[PDB]
Design a protein around this ligand. Structure first.
Ligand SMILES: [Mg+2]
Ligand SMILES: [Mg+2]
Lengths: 739, 735
């Protein structure tokens, strides 16, 4: 029975030339095979371009095979960070690969004809986040493990002071946003619909030609009213200045690539209304779309005569005199919260600011209270209920606060995160219809005006169905209550409540404590419990999941990055993501130049454990469970004993951290008394590692402070790399025992 | 007949009722309704008390004691109006209005000789204080906004100040060390006798309270406020409020927690002025200064000291504010701060008042500022904070659209905190605080106490709790409103209640009903989300929350606490109906003697009647009262739409016509009515006879004059001379 282990890019790739031998040896006695699977940029490129490759140059398309493998129930994947390649990276990977003699073609950035057309679209399949969509087949089980929860408590991170009299607060819309206008239904039949506006005059513009819907599919029709948004802005701006407080705007433009830059840019255009009105005639001429941050406005006015440009810059600053003070991204370099919408990212900025005791940065480099403006009311009210709790009760106590794991609905681009291609800036006032394009039947009608933001969402029944099963599962396996966060007064969430109530009957929920309440009622029910050191599972839709697996982690642990990221696959298999972060190119630099790798592998240590525990459950395997239970104990110890890598050079790096993990794990499997036959195999290793502990760490330290040739970058050399990453002679020897 | 008793009280209430009583009888005679009188005035109660000293046409029925017996007649029906809680000199000014009228009664001047001088002393203490309300309030409270008043509100909203979403205003309470956070309680299965005994660390035995009878099912508490914790709190929070730049305030209720809260209050002062006090302490001590009763008495007592020292004391006090925060003010102009008396900023009035104002208390400059509202005792303070956060978020309430929050309230037999007068002690020395069985020596409940902590034992009996449940149910049944019990599961005492309620709810048909149990703060938020949506929620609460919430919500709904149904549904099945809680305000008796003018106190009675009829309706199933109720409510309603309610003037308005006008109106709707042929009217001696001549009664007694009329007496007055005033026309009594 197999664990598939991804050989990704850059830093965590290097880590695993070290760690995987350790993994292979600990897992053998449980009858666990460990298969490599290469899905690097490099690998994925050579797959797409087999037509250009020699015969034994060719490579198997692993991502594809992984994809198929999603359907097999036995499947068990440990997925590490990997590159979601930018153009620059790919052109580089391309150019490195060519040098190694793979005659793939260049990257025609601007095609000139024939194949350049089709190639740039065939390199396209490689650009961006190619991998996550293929692998993430079935909802989020996400939580902090005991190992980390408990270390957190003994070793609490910093939590700034919440003054009982703080003036920080969330500000959202009360009417005219998506929420308050929202309309939704669950389909009772399959349908083919179009998103069609009927011009107030009668002209019929189609905005989205065909969208296929299945029975049971929940759909929502939702729009942001430009007029309401702008009144709310103007009113809240004035409000903020009258309060003598930082004005801030928290948005997720990196996901909602269509929806949110619009909402963002209207804040800018309004704040500086006085200057835009006088200069809109030039900005439009200059192709200035402030939707993508004020940054661009400045870059383009640079070509202006120093006289004209000096006028605009004066005219802008002039708005500050009647406008409120702005939250900064870089106080010192004058970067405001309007510089790019991709700077202040809502689900990370809000907990960051609440950690900091409800504070944000002013242009004088010092903290003040802030109005956190989140126009769309739906998902903002959550954060305000917390804020109210924290004035009252002070900031959270990580020594004693509970845990809030999140079972999140997200399968098949569920809900808000599927509607990127179904969102439109309205052309003219009219009627916005979702219409059955076969029967002509109109399903949902909206009252819209010019420049409104209209979007259609959907979530399918099988995802919803699985999500209810996973909620009940986690409730059972953990003892925690599970709370469904769903507003009855929100059409969509009513539509979910209809499903949730019905599918709960399809499962054995007798022992358990499972409830459905309001978002804000659930948020407080959870809070009242956390603070008493109790635990509660959040069961939430797709966006709340992205929000709460940043928010509650930050409070409990100080990061959002030492978490179990599990995707229990639809077919009954599992995937274990070791981390949300990048593959960290910077660490790779330190390895090449001065043989030190500061990459932390704590995420892998943790993925491996559940991976084993869960394979331990399905396949009914005692061995495995012990490997989990013990790898549990060891990782705590690795944390207690400060043995995670240092960011220095000379000191312990990624390899030494593997060693100590190998040590405390072997030791645990030696001292354990559940499987005598395991002890026998592991006790000699435990002694070899204990005994030569320092001889080994020395052997490891010995190599640092000089370069390290790894035979490539996007295309590393497996011999060279295995040398560099497994350089201790004594340590390699210790593994070759175990009998 | 099925009957309705009516109380003739004291002063201006007594007056206004010789006027509008005979204009009842009229609309109630066709309903098969009698109206017996009951004189329980200050003046009439001494006459029954002291009757050994009078002749026998000079002799009276003891009208208070008769009502005592009446509480156990399943059908009784009573409308109680304000009356004087007799006093120091107001029994002596009325220990004389008969000696002038001819009645052989004792004088009462203390410092008494050899013993029927201590015994007549004791023997007319009878009629001192609120000695009439504990006779009559026999079983918990039904308190809601009557339909007439609520509707006038949504049509004529009062002012609600803005709540900025950045208000700094908040409640500050103790998180540890306070009664709540260290509470213990139990429910008895056995009747017991207990003592409250201190066990000195050395072993010494101090009996604080020798004997306390406890019956089966009773719920008792042992709680303590730890003086160290309370003062650390005050210190920490004084710093906080100063670093904040906000006003500092102290909301307690010294007028009923007569023992407990003055101590808590006094500590806030001594801590505030710690610099001055830690220097003049010896001197303040020699003088008797007990700042527990407020700075007021300190300034009165340093008046004896010579001017050089007095002003050195006054300066040292004042020099504290350099390192303290600013106080909330009771009277900006006359320089009266929070701390003058503990009876000025009374919590359940001061806190809604504050919230209505946008979260504001007054600075010393007559201007309005943000405030820390310090309620040290955590138990009943968190709800206010919950409201404040709600309003910061959503703005203040909108009277036009918002719903109601009636209140079913546990209070029978001095339930909860309000009966622990005689069971609260400031602890003499550190040791062990025991509730201990006088028969078996078992220690039922124990606490660790130190020097100067406050310790009290609260009890609530089971018979009140059962009624209190049945009442919450019948109100839920008879109104279609959801009803939430307000109960902390994490608070020993309330959790002890949750166990009874859960058990007792089962004993009523609650099949249609929506009846849940929530933590005070959950309950609060929930009913808050519903009012804002114009939805209604009955609140079912403890004794303190019954006192708090019946001010908080009607202040938001109607801008007054004093326009409310106060129904005490009696244990035996019947019911008493209370017009108001306000004073008799004797100041307005003179405006009806020196001149002719009185006060607005009529409105409460109109409403006491509308329910007294409506519930009489289904109690002795009488189609003939359900009518008069709903038509009386229509009538009183437009008596408000048309500004026909009493005036401060002298042209004018008072009960005289507001009086009359609803005769015009509670006839208006009785003739125009059609469901019915019995009461077809028949009340057509016609309403339009008060509309034939409908600007003349008004003028016939406009000429009534002001200048003077005499009631010929004040407390005891005759029955042939307030006719020629309260009943001054000729055209009036006619129709
Ligand atoms: Mg996220
Ligand atoms: Mg009150």
């Amino acid at each position: 029975s197999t664990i598939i282990y991804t050989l990704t890019d850059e830093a965590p790739l290097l880590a695993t030339y070290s760690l995987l031998p350790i993994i292979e040896t600990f897992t053998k006695p449980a009858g666990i095979e460990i298969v490599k699977s290469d899905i690097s940029v490099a690998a994925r490129v050579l797959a797409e371009f087999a037509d250009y490759l020699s015969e034994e140059q060719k490579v198997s398309d692993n991502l594809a095979e992984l994809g198929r493998l999603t359907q097999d129930p036995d499947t068990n994947i440990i997925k590490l960070p990997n590159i979601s390649a930018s153009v620059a990276q790919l052109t580089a990977c391309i150019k490195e690969l060519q040098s190694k003699g793979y005659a793939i073609p260049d990257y025609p950035e601007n095609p000139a004809t024939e194949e350049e057309k089709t190639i740039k679209a065939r390199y396209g399949k490689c650009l961006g986040s190619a991998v996550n969509p293929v692998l993430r087949e079935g909802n989020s089980d996400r939580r902090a493990p005991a190992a980390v929860k408990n270390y957190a408590k003994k070793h609490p991170h910093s939590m700034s002071e919440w003054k009982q009299w703080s003036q920080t607060h969330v500000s959202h819309m009360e009417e005219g946003d998506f929420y308050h206008g929202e309309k939704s239904m669950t389909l009772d039949r399959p349908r083919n619909v179009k998103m069609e506006l009927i011009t107030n005059s009668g002209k019929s513009i189609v905005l989205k030609p065909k969208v296929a819907l299945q029975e049971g599919e929940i759909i929502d029709s939702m729009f942001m009213s430009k007029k309401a948004l702008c009144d709310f802005y103007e009113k809240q701006l004035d409000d903020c200045r009258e309060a003598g407080i930082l004005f801030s705007l928290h948005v997720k433009a990196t996901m909602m690539k269509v929806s949110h830059p619009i909402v963002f840019g209207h804040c800018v255009k309004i704040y500086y209304k006085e200057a835009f009105e006088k200069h809109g005639k030039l900005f439009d001429e200059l192709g200035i779309n402030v939707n993508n941050g004020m940054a661009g406005l400045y870059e383009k006015i640079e070509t202006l005569p120093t006289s004209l440009r000096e006028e605009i810059i004066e005219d802008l600053h002039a708005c500050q005199e009647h406008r409120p003070a702005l939250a900064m991204v870089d106080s010192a370099k004058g970067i405001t919260n309007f510089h790019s919408p991709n700077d202040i990212i809502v689900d990370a900025s809000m907990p960051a600011m609440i950690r900091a005791g409800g504070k944000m940065w002013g242009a004088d480099g010092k903290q003040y209270d802030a109005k956190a403006v989140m126009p769309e009311s739906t998902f903002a009210r959550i954060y305000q209920e917390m804020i109210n709790f924290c004035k009252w009760h002070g900031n959270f106590d990580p020594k004693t606060m509970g845990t809030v794991p999140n079972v999140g609905l997200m399968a098949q681009k569920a809900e808000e995160y599927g509607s990127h291609d179904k969102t439109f800036e309205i052309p003219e006032a009219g009627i916005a219809n979702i219409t059955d394009l076969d029967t002509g039947e109109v399903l949902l009608t909206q009252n819209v005006e010019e420049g409104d933001i209209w979007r259609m969402c959907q979530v399918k029944d099988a995802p919803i169905r699985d999500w209810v099963k996973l909620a009940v599962t986690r409730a059972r396996n953990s003892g925690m209550p599970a709370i469904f966060w769903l507003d009855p007064y929100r059409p969509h969430e009513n539509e979910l409540i209809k499903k949730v109530q019905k599918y709960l009957k399809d499962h054995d929920t007798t022992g358990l404590d499972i409830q459905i309440m309001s978002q804000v009622r659930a948020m407080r029910y959870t809070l009242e419990r956390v603070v008493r050191g109790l635990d509660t599972i959040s069961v939430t839709g797709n966006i709340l999941r992205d929000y709460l697996t940043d928010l509650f982690p930050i409070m409990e642990l100080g990061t959002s990055a030492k978490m179990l990221s599990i995707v229990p696959l639809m077919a009954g298999g599992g995937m274990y993501e070791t981390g949300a972060g990048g593959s960290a190119p910077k660490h790779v630099q330190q390895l090449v130049e001065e043989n030190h790798l500061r990459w932390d592998s704590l995420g892998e240590f943790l993925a491996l454990a559940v991976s084993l525990e869960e394979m331990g459950i399905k396949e009914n395997n005692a061995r495995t469970k012990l490997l989990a239970k013990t790898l549990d104990e060891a990782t705590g110890k690795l944390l207690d004993n400060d043995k995670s890598p240092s960011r220095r050079t000379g000191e312990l790096d990624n390899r030494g951290s593997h060693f100590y993990l190998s040590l405390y794990w072997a030791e645990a499997l030696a001292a354990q008394n559940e499987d005598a036959e395991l002890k026998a195999k592991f006790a000699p290793l435990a002694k070899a590692l204990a005994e030569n502990e320092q001889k080994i760490v020395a052997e490891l330290a010995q190599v640092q402070g000089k370069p390290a040739d790894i035979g490539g970058y996007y295309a590393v050399d497996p011999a060279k790399v295995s040398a560099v990453m497994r350089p201790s002679a004594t340590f390699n020897a210790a593994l070759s025992t175990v009998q």
